[PDB]
Every structure is written in C-alpha cells, then in structure tokens.
Design a protein around this ligand. Structure first.
Ligand SMILES: NC(=O)c1ccc[n+]([C@@H]2O[C@H](COP(=O)([O-])OP(=O)(O)OC[C@H]3O[C@@H](n4cnc5c(N)ncnc54)[C@H](OP(=O)(O)O)[C@@H]3O)[C@@H](O)[C@H]2O)c1
Ligand SMILES: O=C(O)COc1cc(Cl)ccc1C(=O)NCc1cccc([N+](=O)[O-])c1
Length: 316
C-alpha cells in the first residue's frame, strides 16, 4: 500500500505519522530521533503541546546528521484557540516555526473551530469554569490562514475537529482562496466517523485520524472508560495476523484511505507502530472493527459546550 496521499496543493502526505501530544519535552527529542531512524517522515505537532522546541531539536539533528533532507519530511502544526483573531495568526505560526527551527510547515491546521479569549492561558476560564470565548469566527480565521500560504510560511492549510457544517462554511465562502486540504478528527473503532469521512472524502479533503489507539494517556480518562488497546475482540483479530493490537488499530484507518498519527515516546513502540505495511486486514476484519462503533469521544470538553462554534452538537 502506497505510503503517501495526494493533497489539493499537489503535495504528498505520508499516511503514517508520529503524534506528539503528551510526549514530555524531557523525552520527545529521543522519540522523534528514533521515529526518523525507523522511517517516519510525518510528525504531528501543536503549539499547545508545549514541546515544539524539543521536536525541532530532533529534526535539526537528523538533518545535520545527513539522515533525511527537509523536503522528505512532512511537518504539521496547529493554530491554538487563543490565536484566532486575524492579527494574531501570523505571529502564532511564526512562533511555531521558530520553535521547530523550520522555515515552513507542510501543513498548518486550525486546531479547533472554537476561539478563546486571547492571553497567556491556553484555556481561559471564568470563575465558574466555562471557557471564555473570543469574538472571532471561522471564516475570518480561515482568511488569515490563507495569507500564510500566500506568504510562503506554510504549504497547505486545513482544519481539525470541524463538523461537516463548519467545513461547508469554509467551502462556500465567497472569494475562497484555498480549500482546506485536511480535516484532522478523532477516529478509531469506538468512533468510526462514517458520515464525516464520507462527507470530507466526497469534497476532496483528506482525513487524518487522531487518537487511533484511544488515547489511553489522556489526562481526563476515567477507569470505567472503554479501552481499545485492551479490547479482547481486537486482541483476537491481532492474534490471527500475528500482530499487536496497536498494529491492527493503526492499519485499520489506513485501509479507509485515512492518514493516521499514533503517539508514542517509547522507542520499541515507535518502531512497532511503523510495522504496518506488511499485512492486510480482511474484509471481515474491517467490517468487525467498524461494528464496534459507540460514538465514544476521547476528545471533547464540557467547558466548551456552550461556545457558539462547539463542534459536537451536530450529528456529524
Ligand atoms: N487535532 C486534535 O485535536 C488532536 C487531538 C488528540 C490527538 N491529536 C494528535 O494525535 C496523536 C495521537 O493521539 P493521542 O496522543 O491522543 O493517543 P494515541 O496515539 O491513541 O495513544 C497514545 C497512547 O498509546 C500508547 N501506545 C502507543 N503505542 C503503543 C503500542 N504499540 N502498544 C501499547 N501502547 C501504545 C502511548 O504510550 P507511550 O507514549 O508511553 O509509549 C500513549 O499512552 C496525538 O499525539 C496528537 O499528535 C490531535
Ligand atoms: O486538543 C488536542 O490536540 C488534544 O487535547 C488537548 C491537548 C492539550 Cl496539550 C490540552 C488540552 C487538550 C484538550 O482538552 N483538548 C480538547 C479540546 C480542546 C479545545 C476545545 C475543545 N472542544 O471540545 O471544543 C476540546
């Protein structure tokens, strides 16, 4: 199976990348070094992950070591919610570039459709715990993202955690300059995203699946929560292929023509997770995994549910 997918800007995006949310700065440099050594060429980053400097250190080193050239890498980052105002977007992008020690990004995403009050805090809350919104809207933030392409800071722009009506808003914008190349969304057997994937793919937008292992390290996990990596039904599908459960969970979105971005900082797991181009899930396996859907979301904040642009009230 083809290692890259074609984007609307003519660039090719590797279908397997390394996630970096919750990769502590004291451990992520080594993770990225190892990932590049074992063949990862796509790295998913974000300013809010607070580790871009340490990602950038690893990239720089591997470039200087002659292991890879910049053109072979596909680096993604994301505009955080406190920077949706049109006047703040370029500075946010440039901070990410500076931290990553790069002169361009391959892809830059609006991280969430919701804008938050500008300031130092990533999640500005009022005294009663509601997020404080900003007076920003999706279309003006999009126009600011388009300027980043026109100035050469980023090669492609996209969105993340947008519902189909929010995607539609952008597509239907009068005077649109660039269509979104990607929508990065949560997707795994417990949240299979059939309707949103169908929508995006029909519109020429590539979908990236985040939290493909169910984000067991997410900081708001509850012990009763469903656990993909420990699901005995998925274990049994893995055993049949002499692969691990993680390997099955990464191959699954690949066979749906998705990009997938599993996270690890553990060197043996980083290597494990890349070894997914040597087997195929059967039709029955695919059907079985899709059948596990529960509409169960890792990533959703109760404190955001009143925001005008909260994405998850719509069915899709
Ligand atoms: N756009 C968005 O809003 C958004 C939201 C969430 C995630 N993302 C992106 O998607 C990436 C992936 O999602 P995620 O970080 O939520 O979680 P994930 O990739 O579903 O799961 C990562 C967890 O699985 C463990 N793990 C990794 N490989 C394993 C293996 N082979 N066997 C057993 N355990 C394994 C990791 O542990 P160790 O690391 O300790 O090895 C870590 O605890 C993120 O890092 C981020 O880049 C984007
Ligand atoms: O967002 C990610 O990539 C991963 O999740 C993170 C990461 C960090 Cl470093 C901190 C906090 C989160 C988190 O609560 N994300 C959920 C989220 C955020 C904003 C809005 C919403 N929302 O529901 O509108 C949800």
């Amino acid at each position: 199976m083809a290692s890259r997918i074609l984007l609307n800007n003519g660039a090719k995006m590797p279908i397997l990348g390394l996630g970096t949310w919750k990769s502590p700065p004291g451990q992520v440099t080594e993770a990225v070094k190892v990932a590049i050594d074992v063949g990862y060429r796509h790295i998913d980053c974000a300013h809010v992950y607070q580790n871009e400097n340490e990602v950038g250190v690893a990239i720089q080193e591997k470039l200087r070591e002659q292991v890879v050239k910049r053109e072979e890498l596909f680096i993604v980052s994301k505009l955080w919610c406190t920077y949706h105002e049109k006047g703040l977007v370029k500075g946010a992008c440039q901070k990410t570039l500076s931290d990553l020690k790069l002169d361009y990004l391959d892809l830059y995403l609006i991280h969430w459709p919701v804008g938050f009050k500008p300031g130092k805090e990533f999640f500005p809350l009022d005294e009663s715990g509601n997020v404080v919104p900003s007076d920003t809207n999706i279309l003006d933030t999009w126009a600011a993202m388009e300027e980043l392409v026109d100035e050469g800071l980023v090669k492609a722009i996209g969105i993340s955690n947008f519902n189909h009506l929010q995607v539609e808003m952008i597509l239907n914008k009068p005077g649109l300059k660039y269509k979104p190349a990607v929508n990065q969304i949560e997707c795994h057997p417990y949240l299979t995203q059939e309707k949103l994937i169908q929508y995006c793919q029909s519109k020429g937008i590539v979908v990236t699946a985040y939290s493909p292992l169910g984000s067991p390290d997410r900081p708001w996990a509850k012990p009763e929560d469903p656990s993909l990596l420990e699901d005995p039904r998925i274990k049994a599908i893995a055993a049949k292929h002499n692969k691990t459960t993680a390997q099955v969970l990464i191959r699954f979105p690949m066979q749906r023509n998705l990009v997938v971005i599993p996270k690890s900082v553990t060197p043996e797991r980083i290597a494990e997770n890349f070894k997914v181009f040597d087997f195929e899930l059967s039709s029955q396996d695919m059907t079985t995994l899709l059948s596990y859907n529960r509409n169960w979301r890792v990533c959703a904040l109760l404190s955001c549910t009143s925001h005008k642009d909260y994405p998850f009230h719509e069915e899709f």
